[PDB]
């Protein structure tokens, strides 16, 4: 027909051994296209026995799943294609209690996705002023090379590099415990041919080191004519973890007229990724 479970992949935060906490949605996807004629079965076993599992057909042999852990402890996720375990099934998942006082937060394109052979980066900035020890590790189809530089500013930049497509688990640890939402599931894509995230320049008043005022429409342009075709993502937030609104007008030629309005003369951070990869100079730290 013929059944071939080795062509199946099971990825998602709901399958990671550590990091998931109670009252969180534990999500994961299963890829089955190309695995021949078969049958997918997903079971989640917790300390309370059977766990409810919501399934959603994502098209093209991809199926999304969500279970909702309520009590800490060990959960087992069994994923089978024609009676044979898929990938690393069964998955042992240790669900923790509600996270305590967060001393640090993390955001950036490298926590959500990236491109093969390209740098996947994010930033980890301090909450308050109680200093500790930050830990980083990345698990996936290949061993990523991690680099992070303490900046004293309280926000230190983190980068990891790989050369294999797939989903990676990025762990940010504060005093040897996964911070909230850690591990972060990054979807690393294979590089399009014409796509050059390098050379995607973003100039403008809204991105300069100085010169941005509060309640002013701080604009900037993202010229990307020789960068292939790939989605543009603009994300802005202040010194706290609070996002502020961005507006991205596709001007139709390959350039973009981007706008965001700050609402505090406090330092904002504007991240511009092209095809899931930080363009040069991003993260833009703007003294608004």
Swiss-Prot record:
Cell compartment(s), UniProt: Cytoplasm, Cell cortex; Cytoplasm, Cytoskeleton; Perikaryon; Cell projection, Growth cone
Domain of life, per lineage: Eukaryota
Post-translational modification (record): Phosphorylation extent changes in response to cell activation.
Annotated positions of the N6-acetyllysine modification: 33, 225
Ranges occupied by Filamin repeats: 3-95, 96-188, 192-288
Tissues in which the protein is found: Ubiquitous.
Physiological role: Promotes orthogonal branching of actin filaments and links actin filaments to membrane glycoproteins. Anchors various transmembrane proteins to the actin cytoskeleton and serves as a scaffold for a wide range of cytoplasmic signaling proteins. Interaction with FLNB may allow neuroblast migration from the ventricular zone into the cortical plate. Tethers cell surface-localized furin, modulates its rate of internalization and directs its intracellular trafficking. Involved in ciliogenesis.
Family: Belongs to the filamin family.
Domain notes: Comprised of a NH2-terminal actin-binding domain, 24 immunoglobulin-like internally homologous repeats and two hinge regions. Repeat 24 and the second hinge domain are important for dimer formation. Filamin repeat 20 interacts with filamin repeat 21 masking the ligand binding site on filamin repeat 21, resulting in an autoinhibited conformation. The autoinhibition can be relieved by ligands like ITGB7 or FBLIM1. Filamin repeats 19 and 21 can simultaneously engage ligands.
Subunit structure: Homodimer. Interacts with PDLIM2. Interacts with RFLNA and RFLNB. Interacts with FCGR1A, FLNB, FURIN, HSPB7, INPPL1, KCND2, MYOT, MYOZ1, ARHGAP24, PSEN1, PSEN2 and ECSCR. Also interacts with various other binding partners in addition to filamentous actin. Interacts (via N-terminus) with MIS18BP1 (via N-terminus). Interacts (via N-terminus) with TAF1B. Interacts with TMEM67 (via C-terminus) and MKS1. Interacts (via actin-binding domain) with MICALL2 (via CH domain). Interacts (via filamin repeat 5) with SYK; docks SYK to the plasma membrane.
Disease: Periventricular nodular heterotopia 1: A developmental disorder characterized by the presence of periventricular nodules of cerebral gray matter, resulting from a failure of neurons to migrate normally from the lateral ventricular proliferative zone, where they are formed, to the cerebral cortex. PVNH1 is an X-linked dominant form. Heterozygous females have normal intelligence but suffer from seizures and various manifestations outside the central nervous system, especially related to the vascular system. Hemizygous affected males die in the prenatal or perinatal period.
Protein name listed in UniProt: Filamin-A
Species this chain originates from: Homo sapiens
The encoding gene: FLNA
């Amino acid at each position: 027909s013929m059944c071939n479970p080795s062509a199946c992949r099971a990825v998602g935060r709901g399958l990671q051994p550590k990091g998931v906490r109670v009252k969180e949605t534990a999500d994961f996807k299963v890829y089955t296209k190309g695995a021949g004629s078969g049958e997918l079965k997903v079971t989640v076993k917790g300390p309370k026995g059977e766990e409810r599992v919501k399934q959603k057909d994502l098209g093209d042999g991809v199926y999304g799943f969500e279970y909702y852990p309520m009590v800490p402890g060990t959960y087992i996720v069994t994923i089978t294609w024609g009676g044979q375990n898929i990938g690393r099934s069964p998955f042992e998942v240790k669900v923790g209690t509600e996270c305590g006082n967060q001393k640090v937060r993390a955001w950036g394109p490298g926590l959500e996705g990236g491109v093969v052979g390209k740098s996947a980066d994010f930033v980890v900035e301090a909450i308050g002023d109680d200093v500790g020890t930050l830990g980083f590790s990345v698990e996936g189809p290949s061993q990523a090379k991690i680099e992070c530089d303490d900046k004293g500013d309280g926000s230190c930049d983190v980068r990891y590099w790989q050369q294999e497509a797939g989903e990676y688990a990025v762990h940010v640890l504060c005093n040897s415990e996964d911070i909230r939402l850690s591990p972060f599931m990054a979807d690393i894509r294979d590089a399009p041919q014409d796509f050059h995230p390098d050379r995607v320049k973003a100039r403008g008043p809204g991105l300069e080191k100085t010169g941005v005022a509060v309640n002013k429409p701080a604009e900037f342009t993202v010229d990307a004519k020789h960068g292939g075709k790939a989605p543009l993502r603009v994300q802005v937030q202040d010194n706290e973890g609070c996002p502020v609104e961005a507006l991205v007008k596709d001007n139709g030629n390959g350039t973009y007229s981007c706008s965001y309005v700050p609402r505090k003369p406090v330092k904002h951070t504007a991240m511009v990724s092209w095809g899931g990869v930080s363009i040069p100079n991003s993260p833009f730290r703007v003294n608004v």
